[PDB]
Design an enzyme around this catalytic site. Structure first.
Site, short mmCIF file in Angstrom:
data_model
loop_
_atom_site.label_atom_id
_atom_site.label_comp_id
_atom_site.label_asym_id
_atom_site.label_seq_id
_atom_site.Cartn_x
_atom_site.Cartn_y
_atom_site.Cartn_z
N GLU A 118 5.85 -57.25 -50.62
CA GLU A 118 7.09 -58.01 -50.60
C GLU A 118 7.13 -58.90 -49.35
O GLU A 118 6.68 -58.48 -48.28
CB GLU A 118 8.30 -57.09 -50.61
N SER A 142 10.33 -57.17 -58.96
CA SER A 142 10.77 -55.86 -58.49
C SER A 142 10.47 -54.74 -59.48
O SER A 142 10.49 -53.57 -59.09
CB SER A 142 12.27 -55.89 -58.21
N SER A 183 16.65 -51.64 -55.12
CA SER A 183 15.65 -52.69 -55.07
C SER A 183 15.50 -53.22 -53.64
O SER A 183 15.45 -54.42 -53.40
CB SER A 183 15.97 -53.81 -56.06
C1 NXL Z 1 12.98 -57.84 -57.09
O1 NXL Z 1 12.90 -58.41 -58.16
N1 NXL Z 1 13.66 -58.31 -56.03
C2 NXL Z 1 14.11 -57.45 -54.93
C3 NXL Z 1 15.62 -57.37 -55.10
N2 NXL Z 1 15.92 -56.88 -56.47
O2 NXL Z 1 16.00 -57.78 -57.60
S1 NXL Z 1 16.93 -57.17 -58.79
O3 NXL Z 1 18.16 -56.80 -58.12
O4 NXL Z 1 17.05 -58.28 -59.70
O5 NXL Z 1 16.16 -56.05 -59.29
C4 NXL Z 1 16.11 -58.78 -54.76
C5 NXL Z 1 15.63 -59.80 -55.79
C6 NXL Z 1 14.12 -59.71 -56.02
C7 NXL Z 1 13.41 -60.52 -54.93
N3 NXL Z 1 14.18 -61.21 -54.11
O6 NXL Z 1 12.18 -60.49 -54.82
#
Ligand code: NXL
Length: 261
Positions: free
Chosen positions: A139, A43, A103
């Protein structure tokens, strides 16, 4: 040297691979641990994507206000904001804020699509002097974090230099830089990571990430009390795919970095 040894001992006790890059902008002094090894950004790549849309907004006045249709099919694995607006709309500013501060993975995919796909994020990285960053997937598959896989990776050193250019330098226009810093400072997900290893009086804007292989990341611009700002990238990944997140390791790395300052 002592910092290098303590970070090596932290990594050894962590059971994984740790990457750290600090830039002290008071004097441009750097601290690196595996600083030129690639790590999956997960992320934290969202920073680049949001910055890239901010860069687009420098030559499109009303771009950040442009509505974007959120469809049911757009939702992926983590969409805490976008689900409120499916069958509705979000502006690119709202999508950038959701991606950076919550995120939201659907928001990140909308940012990616606004740039023409992952290669458009990579192209922005190239345009601001980052030769290492590569974004290859959308994503959620950009988070596979497979050892040895260069897709969706960067190095701590490259990400630290880039984050400095975006938040403290002039890779963005002044208003866009200020908006990016405002977004980073309002992150909701960062209190257990770099920030946990820093004195409470220091202001932090950061973006966390996590993925498979217990991948646990944070990139931060830090304003210590009474000192010029720091840029700190702490990347961490583990040998087995199902490993649990290790934000405490990022906090420990931040404590080690902070203590030599
Ligand atoms: C990014 O790393 N992601 C999207 C979202 N945020 O992670 S964080 O809260 O640790 O920044 C969910 C976890 C992660 C993913 N699932 O890809």
């Amino acid at each position: 040297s002592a910092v290098q040894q303590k970070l090596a001992a932290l990594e050894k006790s962590s059971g994984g691979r740790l990457g750290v890059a600090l830039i002290d902008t008071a004097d441009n002094t750097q601290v690196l641990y595996r600083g030129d090894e690639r790590f999956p950004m997960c992320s934290t790549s969202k920073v680049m994507a949001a910055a890239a849309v901010l860069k687009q907004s420098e030559t499109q006045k009303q771009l950040l206000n442009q509505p974007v249709e959120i469809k049911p099919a757009d939702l992926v694995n983590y969409n805490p904001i976008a689900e409120k607006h499916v069958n509705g709309t979000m502006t690119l500013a709202e999508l950038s804020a959701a991606a950076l501060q919550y995120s939201d993975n659907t928001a990140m995919n909308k940012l990616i699509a606004q740039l023409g796909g992952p290669g458009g994020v990579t192209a922005f990285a190239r345009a601001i002097g980052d030769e290492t960053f590569r974004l290859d997937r959308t994503e959620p598959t950009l988070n596979t974090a497979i050892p040895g896989d260069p897709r969706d990776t960067t190095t701590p050193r490259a990400m630290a230099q880039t984050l400095r250019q975006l938040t403290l330098g002039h890779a963005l226009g002044e208003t866009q830089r200020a908006q990016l810093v405002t977004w980073l400072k309002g992150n909701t997900t960062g209190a257990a990571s770099i920030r946990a290893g820093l004195p409470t009086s220091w202001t932090v804007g950061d973006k966390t990430g996590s993925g498979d292989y217990g991948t646990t990341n944070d990139i931060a611009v830090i304003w210590p009390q009474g000192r010029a700002p720091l840029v700190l990238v702490t990347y961490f990944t583990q040998p087995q795919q199902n490993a649990e997140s290790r934000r405490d390791v990022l906090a420990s790395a931040a404590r080690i970095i902070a203590e030599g300052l």
